[PDB]
Amino acid sequence: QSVTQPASVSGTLGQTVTISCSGSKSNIGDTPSYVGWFQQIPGTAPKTLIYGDGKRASGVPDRFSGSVSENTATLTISGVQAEDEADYWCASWDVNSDSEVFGGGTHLTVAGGPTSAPSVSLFPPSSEELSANKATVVCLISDFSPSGLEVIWKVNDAVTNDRVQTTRPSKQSNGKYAASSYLTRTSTEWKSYSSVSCQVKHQGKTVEKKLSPSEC
């Protein structure tokens, strides 16, 4: 059986938001009712928000509530906070397949927080790594909001796109976002370059940091 929920929902801080989960009479519409709602912060295990007959789990804030109308269930977040930005899953039990069915998931992006410029930290290949004919330049961007940005590597002063791998931004413990980019070269390539650079474009600003090979 298949239950479908929106792929993405956006909300401003303080704004009431709803995530909806559409199913069938065999599952979401089955009586007595069971529809679970679970919150997941990417990279963590899911936590139960709503359980059973739209009941709020222990220790869950009052702003989360769950309801069902016919074959469609609905999670309501009344006053989205920044901590609520996360993935949300609906589950139900289908009696025709005697099986628990989950939705596709819904990413809630809570926007409207304060803006912060990105701190860029550029790190050169370690001498140990270089002892293996391997060079990894590491660019760590931190303490920036909103989540979106662009990373640009440059060898010498020209833009390069080969062996570049960036990770999608992720929230920090303080609430801002962070990202990592890796420039992979051979030790000879690194020691031959005049200057490597990592540039970050965010909210119209640009922050560039530069490194150069040494015999340290």
């Binding site: 089955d30 009586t31 007595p32 039990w93 009696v95 025709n96 005697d98």
Partner: protein, 64 residues
């Protein structure tokens, strides 16, 4: 049952109510809550989740 099987649809101990149904069967689900026993009546014979006691029958207004 002129247009189909006639069957009760009242809930728990509410005043008996009936409806006409295209199914040739009719059901009485019963389960429990902190409030006590909860009964649900209708037509067909649905599959239930564990914990629900399903009764069903195939004569007019048999699911009281």
């Amino acid at each position: 049952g002129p247009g189909g099987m006639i069957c009760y649809n009242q809930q728990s101990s509410q005043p008996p109510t009936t409806k006409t149904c295209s199914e040739t069967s009719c059901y009485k689900k019963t389960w429990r809550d902190h409030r006590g026993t909860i009964i649900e009546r209708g037509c067909g014979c649905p599959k239930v989740k564990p914990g629900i006691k399903l009764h069903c029958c195939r004569t007019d207004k048999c699911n009281n």
